[PDB]
Write a protein that binds this ligand. Structure first.
Ligand SMILES: [Mg+2]
Ligand SMILES: [Mg+2]
Ligand SMILES: [Mg+2]
Ligand code: NA
Ligand code: NA
Ligand code: NA
Ligand code: NA
Ligand code: NA
Lengths: 1011, 1011
């Protein structure tokens, strides 16, 4: 019998799913959520053995331990131990598509454990084993006898072991198969791994036991009265003395309580459920649950004899909140949500897909620190602890089934096939049966990227029938099918329609108002944070806030899916698809995160925070208007900090308490400002500071900021007339200008400033030449590979037009000596196949004050793909420690991703100006700069720049960040103009038109000097 | 592995479900629906042995035939060969309620066959085996080798035999388990059998094959234009040269054709279905399919090469029809339906649940002959030919899933369990896949009597999503759940509410207008025809006709589920529950038909035929208005015959052809009425006749009738004064009267007429005593038996009051002499435990003409249960040939079942006056009778009566008709008054208040005379 190749069989002898149990026998331990002695952990050291296929496991293995076995940590993924390779493939199945068959060579992993069982446990009561997560299907033996079988990689599989165990020493044997008919529904865009990867545990229940419980909370019209409604189910022999008591606690007060015998209401012509009882507790003025204020009451479900003997107590955290869609909005406790969400995969760089508390918490605090309030379980039910943290710390969660059939042609081929409705139902019902009493789950999802098939309709309805407290969403089949209560497209652009056939991604603003449309829209995936990305983020939030029915989205995604490899020396590095002998593979597409796998944040993460702010600001003369975007909480942990500066020079600053009601407003008057006497632009900068620490933030946390321009007085006063006049010395090869101990050289055969000297030390390593290219970002590149070109990729259009192999061509090199300055005039052309791509017309002016004034006017051929940048580079000899600039910072910014950056005087170490994306590209730019200092040099103007030890050439050549070597000197790029980075998605051009460089003609001017 | 005890395993290696195939290789054979070489029936003499449990089956049966095995016929139920008992159980399971387990004693049938196969089937192609129905689960071997496993007893199981087939002799081996986890979904109110009870066959397909095809027909606003859409699916190797052609035939005329290459439209992001194609044929002015006119087109689906070579062809019948529910109405072709329907179980008194063409055709004719237009497949999908017969003769069909969990407590224990959804979904989905192309199927049913659970919700939505062309219904959980498009209760009375908790059965009229309700109502069952029943039928049809949203129902039900047993003298007799040693059993409850098992009608059938007429009549003076109720046809096969008669004596008649349009009115004026000479009542009669034979009826079929009272001439002339005087001769013991050769003897102690005389021939045996009781009908008894008494039952009310044993207690017996006559005056009182139940006061009068005028006046204690009858009985000495009566008939009628009867002179043999219900009771009543001749006797007046060789004693004491024996002479009951027979259901009192005898005081006079 080949059960792993049969969608008719997804389990054998597996127990019914249910909410989390611990089988407490002291009601007080249950109340306080302390450990229970009836819930043992079996996590630790086990005996592992790898085999190429199930047919190749020795028959002795069932009875005796294998000599060639190893001792390994369970839970784990055997790939993370090196037994075989993890595979990164997005869409295409890692297997031959031949349902329901799998490869014959089926990497098989043979886990065993020798553990001890106390005698008491076996004398009375049921003993079961719980496999929280096994990938992707496994058989189970206990002491040589066969126990059962199970599929689904992401929901617990439970097995009654009462009849199999003995006193003291016992032995498990778990035959985990990598490939199974399960895998056809587990085709998510993520590393393919396997094994026993979540907790293993033993559960001792009484024979007469609580077998299930459902908590429901409904309200009156203003949430001042609530009825908690708990349905309890039991197994065992029914007796009149039996009772369930349900008691609700807020901290340590008991606020409500209900006691009844078993025997539910009459349901039909045969009567009612003898083995169920429903308790109804009235609760005046309940404290409501939200992400803002995550209030939690505690429910204790006691099964006991009426005369007062506790049989067992089970329990859960309860949060009084109401989720519904009325008149086209998604309401929570009456109010319209704004979903500042992120998609988060369960991933660790060392541990693979094995989740731990420390990392989950690290993830949550950062999420909440950067202004998120929601997270999608993409694309499976998470480790059970995760919901508990979301319950407690406060987050809106979308719980999503382990169903993805992305590799199918068409994508619905399995989801429309009735013979797959059994395996799909199991993946939806068992999630619901497991998670339905977690407050943090507000939305149920039917899975991911699996077309639209009658099965989606069937299961959608099943949920709706079983659980009306949570709306049901599903993106498949074009995001607005009959299987979704919410339009939830992935990567639908704000303004631009992408009218694909059958499944068009309409513009979000447009989608809402389609004939007969009324539903709310919350993107399930948007802003594809792969590499240098999130260009266009502000465009969504402006929209989100303007349109009531646009209620947010979920970014793709949270954490880069990189893995650690070690080199010859034992030094660690970050690996992506293909780096494991895995073939085929989608290379670096596993890394679409806001943070690196170690949780160091991409610069993209700051923009998200600033846009996801909970306070909005307007300025009107000398009045700041603060508006709250909170639905429930006041601003009881907020002070407003303001600062006025003349070009980075602090002039004044104050502090005013924020006392803003939810959705309310505060008007703040600033003192009459001192009106400055010297030239420059003023900048007002408000910051919202949280003076007090919280569960999720430190004292002083900045949760919001904003800048404005105030008065500007333009410099009209002249520079002092310097008496000295620079000497031009014309040679055969060079126009050499001199001033004091300062020296310029202009190679006349190339037409560039080829050297400088301060005193007598050389200042340059490469000549100062124009640049109209960049080391391509992931969004420039997209799906394009050497063997499958996408000629519509920005990079591939740039290559074809000859941008990267465009040779300069000298047209003019002239010197003029003036009254008090020497003037150099150059003109250039870049050509590819008899085609002038660009033309650059320059003037250099060196005066008696030793300040070189460069003027650059560039022509761009109207029919060459709009250029990546319009600027200059050189390779200075200088390597300094500090970069000081007056401009946008402190972090990396680009034209279409620069809202979170502030205009000010910044100062940082040189390595902070390099941004270490695993896949190396252009990086570290800061726009809107008026002054740049780097050692002896100063640049003034109005430009964008980056500075590092990495040439654009080395960047575009190198495949991995760790393979980069610090080049000699410092490479500087000073752009007058720079193309946006885009990132609406990352496999089609996504840089919005107003961010592409199409003006045709460009002009920028730089004063270059030494101080 | 015990698969018969696992609802996670419903099949192994079973090929997919599909419409009926034939793999024709000649398009003309396809078009004409002739046999195909490629489909062999394996029905015939198989080998069979029976086993007590699957564990007792020897391993030598897989390779060789067991010598002890008998050669038996297949298809069959092994019960009908008498290998074990058939079990009749209504609600309670035939096994212990222990999901998923069945008993370890599980009757097991070992079928097998040695067969030979064509060389070309061994050479190429797919050869599958198709068991149309195996009850209940089975394993399959071919040539010693294991093939697969199957469940669900009422849909076909198909497996591929290609890899198993050998040269020469092959051997099948089918192990049939009577009980399985499948038994828990098959709990219908019927006989419990098993075996291979439907067709077994071999189908030989090309490798590149048609694997599915869908035929849809949509319409415009007037059905003057129609599109036929045909979705075609294939398996095997696609090649650029393959084509599909869908042609549509009407008689010998192609009407339209569609040819195209495989390649469907873009479905989702990943493309379309390359292995499918959808053909669209435009058809102008189509002939629509209705039960009124079964207009059929023929559809041929050719898989062929573009160069013109045919690979194979499949085909079906097409009826252009649209079924929608709009503004609260079930419309067919845009017209509101009136469902004149019945539930029909697959039953035969010799063969069990095996079906044949001769039986079906018999059933279909009879139903259509008796004014039925719809039928419910109660409660499973039927043998496949049934739908074809329905398509062709024209009946509306409810196709019902094979899911019934009547025995669960509560009824939804399984249907609300997500562990049972897979097993359930197979049973629903696979019916559609099979049956979706039959025009006759207008409604999908989700099963029967299984409560309401989320599984029902899930599958409803699946059907809506998969087949939008058909409304889905289901009675479970209240008859108006979220799971039905039609309010489809069972046994919801017309005017009376029955406010049951959770599942109330409202009065149908009230149900419609329940607040917020809009859906239409059609009873999925009504009018329990159990024994002497169908009383109160006319009340349904009056309401059906008045309320537009009441759109009919299906009677429970067609045929009696009696099974033939033979006696000691080898003589057949009809047997019910417990007659096979089966226990527990629900006795005569398997028998609720309008026809007997042999398809002889019960007398309730003629009532139904009358009430379900298609022409309505009114009389206004001399003007008959004839109204057609037909939705589509004109009366192209009807002529009205009219007839006037003065007390049975023809006065005039005539014919006028009906030329009535559908839903129109014809006014037929009767000629100047011939005014009669004598004294009596004129009665108008009208019979509608079909002169031409049809496919469903002989030439001369009477389809409708109606009577009316016209002018009455009250008799006034005085008796012609005779010159004879009756002489009173009073003795001590008996008041005795003479008159010529006539002699009357009234007893003084009893107080009744004890003996009459004609010469020396005594006329009586049992004296003319009163009667206030009847041998109880099935409706009178209900659910009550000796061990559990139902105190509510009509019978148990009469038993417990004394009605059945109370004795006459004479209060007076006098004899005054009149001038021209003699006058006897009696009084009686009936008592029990000191209570006076009935006082009876009579006055016999004998004049010189021989006429004896009996005048009766009865008192009834207001607080005794209302009695079954008020009248007289005597056992007459003579045994006769004929009965002759002026009054309603000719067939048996009761107060609430006499609309179908007609007033006239009827002459039948004595045995037609006895109705041989398998459970004997009160029978052969004829109401509204004015004259009654039998032998020389004659009873005049206004009364009802029955006349048989069986006493009310023998009938109430015998439980089976076959065990009755004619008694000496003839029992006559003459009733002044009879209570209704009832039957809105058969488990609670259902006799309507207006047919209960409740007045307290009752009068009626008789005249007895020798003619
Ligand atoms: Mg995907
Ligand atoms: Mg089974
Ligand atoms: Mg039933
Ligand atoms: Na909004
Ligand atoms: Na990805
Ligand atoms: Na690179
Ligand atoms: Na009607
Ligand atoms: Na029955």
């Amino acid at each position: 019998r080949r059960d792993w190749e049969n969608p008719g069989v997804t389990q054998l002898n597996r127990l019914a799913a249910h909410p989390p149990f611990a089988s407490w026998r002291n009601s007080e331990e249950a109340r306080t959520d302390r450990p229970s002695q009836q819930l043992r952990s079996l996590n630790g050291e086990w005996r592992f053995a790898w085999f190429p296929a199930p047919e190749a496991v020795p028959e002795s293995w069932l009875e005796c331990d294998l000599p060639e076995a190893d001792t390994v940590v369970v839970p784990s993924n055997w790939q993370m131990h090196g037994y075989d390779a993890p595979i990164y493939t997005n869409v295409t199945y890692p297997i031959t598509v031949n349902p329901p068959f799998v490869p014959t060579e089926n990497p098989t992993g043979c886990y065993s454990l020798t553990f001890n069982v106390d005698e008491s446990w076996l004398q009375e009561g049921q003993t079961r084993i719980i496999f929280d997560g096994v990938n992707s299907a496994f058989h189970l033996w206990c002491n040589g006898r066969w126990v059962g079988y199970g599929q689904d990689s992401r929901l617990p599989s439970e097995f009654d072991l009462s009849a199999f165990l003995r006193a003291g020493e016992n032995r498990l044997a778990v035959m985990v198969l990598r490939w199974s008919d399960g895998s056809y529904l587990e085709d998510q865009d993520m590393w393919r791994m396997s094994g026993i990867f979540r907790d293993v545990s033993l559960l001792h229940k009484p024979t007469t036991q609580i077998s299930d419980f459902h908590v429901a909370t409904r309200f009156n019209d203003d949430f001042s009265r609530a009825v908690l409604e708990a349905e309890v189910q039991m197994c065992g022999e029914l007796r009149d003395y039996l009772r369930v008591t349900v008691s609700l606690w807020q901290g340590e007060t008991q606020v409500a309580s209900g006691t009844a015998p078993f025997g539910g209401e009459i349901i039909d012509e045969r009567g009612g459920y003898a083995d169920r009882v429903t308790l109804r507790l009235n609760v005046e003025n309940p404290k409501l649950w939200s992400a803002e204020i995550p209030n939690l009451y505690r429910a204790v479900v006691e099964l006991h004899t009426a005369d007062g003997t506790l049989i067992e107590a089970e329990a859960c955290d309860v949060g009084f909140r109401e989720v519904r869609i009325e008149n086209g909005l998604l309401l929570l406790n009456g109010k319209p949500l704004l979903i500042r969400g992120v998609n988060r995969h369960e991933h660790h760089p060392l541990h693979g897909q094995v989740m731990d508390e420390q990392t989950m918490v690290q993830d949550i605090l950062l999420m909440k620190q950067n202004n998120f309030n929601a997270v999608r379980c993409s694309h499976y039910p998470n480790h059970p602890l995760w919901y508990t943290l979301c319950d407690r710390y406060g987050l809106y969660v979308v719980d999503e089934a382990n169903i993805e059939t992305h590799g199918m042609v068409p994508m619905n081929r399995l989801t429309d096939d009735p013979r797959w409705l059994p395996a799909m139902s199991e993946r939806v019902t068992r999630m619901v049966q497991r998670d339905r009493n977690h407050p943090s789950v507000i939305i149920w999802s039917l899975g991911d990227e699996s077309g639209h098939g009658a099965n989606h309709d069937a299961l959608y309805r099943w949920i709706k029938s079983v659980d009306p407290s949570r709306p049901v969403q599903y993106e498949g089949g074009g995001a607005d099918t009959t299987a979704t209560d919410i339009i939830c497209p992935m990567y639908a652009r704000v303004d631009e329609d992408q009218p694909f056939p059958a499944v068009p991604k309409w513009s979000i603003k447009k989608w809402l108002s389609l004939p007969g449309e009324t539903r709310p829209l919350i993107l399930c995936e948007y802003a594809h944070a792969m590499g240098n990305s999130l260009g266009g983020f502000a465009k969504y939030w402006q929209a989100f806030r303007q349109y009531p029915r646009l209620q947010g989205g979920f970014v793709w995604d949270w954490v880069d899916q990189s893995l650690i490899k070690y080199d010859e020396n034992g030094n660690p590095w970050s690996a992506y698809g293909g780096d494991f002998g895995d073939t085929p593979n989608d290379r670096q597409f596993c890394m679409n995160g806001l943070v690196f796998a170690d949780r160091t944040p991409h610069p993209a993460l700051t923009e998200a925070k600033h846009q996801q702010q909970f306070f909005q600001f307007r300025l009107s003369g000398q009045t700041i208007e603060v508006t709250s975007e909170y639905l429930f909480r006041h601003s009881d942990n907020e002070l407003l900090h303001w600062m006025v500066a003349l070009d980075g020079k602090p002039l004044a600053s104050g502090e005013v308490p924020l006392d803003v009601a939810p959705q309310g407003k505060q008007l703040i008057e600033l003192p009459e400002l001192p009106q400055p006497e010297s030239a420059g632009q003023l900048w007002l900068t408000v910051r919202v500071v949280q003076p007090n620490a919280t569960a999720w933030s430190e004292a002083g946390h900045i949760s919001a900021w904003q800048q404005w321009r105030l008065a500007e007085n333009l410099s009209v006063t002249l520079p002092a007339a310097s008496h000295a006049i620079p000497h031009l010395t014309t040679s055969e090869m060079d126009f050499c200008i001199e001033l004091g101990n300062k020296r310029w050289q202009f190679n006349r055969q190339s037409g560039f400033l080829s050297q400088m000297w301060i005193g007598d030390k050389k200042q340059l390593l490469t000549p100062l030449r124009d640049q109209f290219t960049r080391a391509p970002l992931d969004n420039d590149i997209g799906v394009s590979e050497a063997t499958r070109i996408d000629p519509n990729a920005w990079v591939e259009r740039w290559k074809a037009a000859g941008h990267y192999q465009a040779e300069a061509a000298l047209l003019q090199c002239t010197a003029d000596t003036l009254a008090d300055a020497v003037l150099i005039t150059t003109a250039h052309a870049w050509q590819h196949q008899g085609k002038t791509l660009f033309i650059s017309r320059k003037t250099y002016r060196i005066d008696g004050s030793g300040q070189m004034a460069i003027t650059v006017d560039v022509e761009v051929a109207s029919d060459t793909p709009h250029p990546a940048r319009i600027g200059l580079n050189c390779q200075l000899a200088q390597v300094a420690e500090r970069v000081n600039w007056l401009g946008l910072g402190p972090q990396e910014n680009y034209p279409d991703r620069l809202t979170a950056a502030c205009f000010d005087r910044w100062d940082l170490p040189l390595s902070d100006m390099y941004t270490p994306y695993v896949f190396p590209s252009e990086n570290g730019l800061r726009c809107g700069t008026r002054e740049l200092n780097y050692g002896p040099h100063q640049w003034r103007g109005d430009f964008q720049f980056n500075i590092s030890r990495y040439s654009q050439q080395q960047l575009m050549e190198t495949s991995h960040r760790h393979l980069l070597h610090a080049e000699e000197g410092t490479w500087l790029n000073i752009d007058g103009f720079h193309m946006g980075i885009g990132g609406d998605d990352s496999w089609s051009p996504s840089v919005s038109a107003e961010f592409q460089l199409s003006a045709g003609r460009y002009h920028y001017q730089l004063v270059w000097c030494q101080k």
